[PDB]
Structure 1
Amino acid sequence: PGDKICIGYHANNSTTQVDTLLEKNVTVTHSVELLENQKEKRFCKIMNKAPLDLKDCTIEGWILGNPKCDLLLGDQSWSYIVERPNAQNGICYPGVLNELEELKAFIGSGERVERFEMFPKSTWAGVDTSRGVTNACPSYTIDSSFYRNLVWIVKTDSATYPVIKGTYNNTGTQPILYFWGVHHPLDTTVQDNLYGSGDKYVRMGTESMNFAKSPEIAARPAVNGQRSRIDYYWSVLRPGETLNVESNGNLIAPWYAYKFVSTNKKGAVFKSDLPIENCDATCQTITGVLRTNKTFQNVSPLWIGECPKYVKSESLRLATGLRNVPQIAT
């Protein structure tokens, strides 16, 4: 009958709930989801730079120059690297690439390489170059080939294999990443056939590095039709450093090598089979692009670029409005 004034609060048709320490499933009038769970299942360009697709080649197959990896041969610039889980073309002549995990880590570092001839075949005197080829390393065109960045050196028709020497002096401003190897015959017979007689060695050095290896001869279980092995090695010739190569025999020599540009960016190698497309991203995880404003994400801990913090949560919804208590309509 009389004039009323009442104090109250807002309600709405919101059905969104939050949890609190004291109570679960509290419907509130307004809230914000702080966690992202959506992704685009693909790889895009970071800082407008395209990632390197290694396609059917592993990281080894790539930087050694596996003959089937010619599509990748030469200059490459990348924001990150993508290596397909079942790439076939890696180390084709059986053997170990020594310090492999630390090489993969170093390559992940770079934003760019320049291929160039480091030791011309003429460098080595008194030996045969052009027979350094194998059936375990076909190209797509030829059944017997070899890595594009290494010379498998063999003694010429004279029984002796001479001492050979090689020098390269990095007068540049960039570190140089380069590879060599030491061949290990399954036979003393094969050893004699390919190299001299007597104690053989491979020695190398710089102002800050030594290396000495001799052959270790034995029959190993066949791989790619080979019971012999090659020990592969890698190194980084700093700006202003000089390399000296000296060998008695069994040298697989450096032929081409890379000027190496290290990156401001953190760098990444993603093992994945997701597509690479002509798109741009700010945040690239290993399982996808996050395209978001949110603070948290549940997609992946592994990423390059600017991503939200990774958590295990399914949802992180913050209440901003109040407990929603709308009148029952009937």
Structure 2
Amino acid sequence: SDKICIGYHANNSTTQVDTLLEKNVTVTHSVELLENQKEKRFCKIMNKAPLDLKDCTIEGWILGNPKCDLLLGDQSWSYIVERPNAQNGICYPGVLNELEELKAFIGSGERVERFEMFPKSTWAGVDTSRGVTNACPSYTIDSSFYRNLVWIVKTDSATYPVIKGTYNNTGTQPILYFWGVHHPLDTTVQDNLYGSGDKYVRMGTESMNFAKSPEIAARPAVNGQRSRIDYYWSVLRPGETLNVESNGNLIAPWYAYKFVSTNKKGAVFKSDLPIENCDATCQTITGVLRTNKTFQNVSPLWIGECPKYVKSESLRLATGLRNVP
């Protein structure tokens, strides 16, 4: 007798899926939706190389710590790599005010161009050339100072006069710039450097003003210094003008950066990982993913076009049927 039978496919698959009803069900075909592989390195994104700060922090880079000269000048970057043990940051002890908001502003950019904003001749009747300190050396000169700032002191002869400077930002780009106020450990050093009298630093713009006075006091020694500097930063917008006025204690702006903002989102990765000559479309803090999968369990932090981060080990979707060979 003739048979006709109805039936279904089987094969040699041992791949399994879960359902609400049943765990470890072997199926003929399935697709894994989650990526768990990464190359442990940093690559170019959109063909642009990241910026390796090497043995400098963001602070050291952007203030011009003399041991950060290899970074000096123009930079372009897809993202920034700060090495977690970098030694060269703020050499002369003090606080950089609004540091976290600075680290965020810098991260939102893609290029800086360094330029002289105030030449030293700006400041009349003062010494611009002995503003240097052993807290803050080069690899060759063991007494130096930040390359983007000038520590102004009075001339031997004289009084510290009122000094003034103005800069009109007639460009198309916003300018990131820096200054400070010196806080000597005691009165003697105050008088040496700046003379006697109530001292001030004042600055202003069509939209900001600033005014600080020295706070003389001995604080705990850091790189041999019981004095301090308070560092400050700001952004002179296109069309704005800056006026600087001081009669003492000014750590003046010298060089600043024309800053260009990213329409994208930017990143600052604190990592040990090597930077290699490779391209990539997705870069996570812990490595690059090269994948077409729609999920990943590597890292929530990245730039580029990455898959959605989830905590799963696996996300395997059945396509075929239950395999019974």
CA distance in 1, matches of 2:278, 2:60: 27
CA distance in 2, matches of 1:232, 1:35: 47
| CA RMSD in angstroms, aligned pairs only | 0.5
Q: How many residues align?
A: 325
Q: Which residue of 2 aligns with 1:177?
A: 176
Tell me which stretches of 4 or more aligned residues in structure 1 moved more than 2 Å: none
How far is 1:264 from its partner?
1.6
How far is 1:36 from its partner?
0.3
Q: Which residue of 2 aligns with 1:56?
A: 55
CA distance in 1, matches of 2:213, 2:108: 32
How far is 1:158 from its partner?
2.8
Question: Alignment identity in percent?
Answer: 100
How far is 1:248 from its partner?
1.0
* Cα displacement string for residues 280-306 of structure 1 (whole angstroms, at most 9, x for unaligned residues): 000000000000000000000000000
CA distance in 1, matches of 2:140, 2:264: 38
How far is 1:37 from its partner?
0.3
How far is 1:265 from its partner?
1.9
Q: Which residue of 2 aligns with 1:27?
A: 26
CA distance in 1, matches of 2:195, 2:23: 81
CA distance in 1, matches of 2:151, 2:237: 25
CA distance in 2, matches of 1:259, 1:212: 25
CA distance in 1, matches of 2:43, 2:251: 38
How far is 1:196 from its partner?
1.5
Unaligned segments of structure 1, at least 5 residues: none
* Cα displacement string for residues 48-83 of structure 1 (whole angstroms, at most 9, x for unaligned residues): 000000000000000000000000000000010000
* Cα displacement string for residues 247-290 of structure 1 (whole angstroms, at most 9, x for unaligned residues): 01000000000000000221100000100011000000000000
How far is 1:11 from its partner?
0.8
CA distance in 2, matches of 1:135, 1:185: 15
CA distance in 2, matches of 1:77, 1:191: 41
| Partner SS state of residue 203, structure 1 | strand
CA distance in 1, matches of 2:235, 2:157: 35
CA distance in 2, matches of 1:264, 1:47: 14
* Cα displacement string for residues 13-45 of structure 1 (whole angstroms, at most 9, x for unaligned residues): 111111110111111010000000000000000
* Cα displacement string for residues 215-259 of structure 1 (whole angstroms, at most 9, x for unaligned residues): 011111100111101000000000000000000100000000000
Moved more, 32-41 or 2-11: 2-11
CA distance in 1, matches of 2:206, 2:232: 18
* Cα displacement string for residues 75-97 of structure 1 (whole angstroms, at most 9, x for unaligned residues): 00001000000000000000000
Moved more, 78-87 or 156-165: 156-165
CA distance in 2, matches of 1:70, 1:127: 27
How far is 1:159 from its partner?
4.1
CA distance in 2, matches of 1:10, 1:217: 87
* Cα displacement string for residues 293-322 of structure 1 (whole angstroms, at most 9, x for unaligned residues): 000000000000000000000000000001
CA distance in 1, matches of 2:95, 2:323: 66
CA distance in 1, matches of 2:142, 2:165: 30
* Cα displacement string for residues 197-216 of structure 1 (whole angstroms, at most 9, x for unaligned residues): 01000000000000000001
| Partner SS state of residue 192, structure 2 | helix
| Partner SS state of residue 129, structure 1 | coil
Q: Which residue of 2 aligns with 1:225?
A: 224
Q: Which residue of 1 aligns with 2:268?
A: 269
Q: Which residue of 1 aligns with 2:201?
A: 202
Unaligned segments of structure 2, at least 5 residues: none
* Cα displacement string for residues 95-121 of structure 1 (whole angstroms, at most 9, x for unaligned residues): 000000000000001100000000000
CA distance in 2, matches of 1:228, 1:4: 100
| Partner SS state of residue 111, structure 1 | strand
Which runs of structure 2 are paired with 1:1-330 in the superposition (5 Å)?
Answer: 2-326=1-325
CA distance in 2, matches of 1:145, 1:158: 24
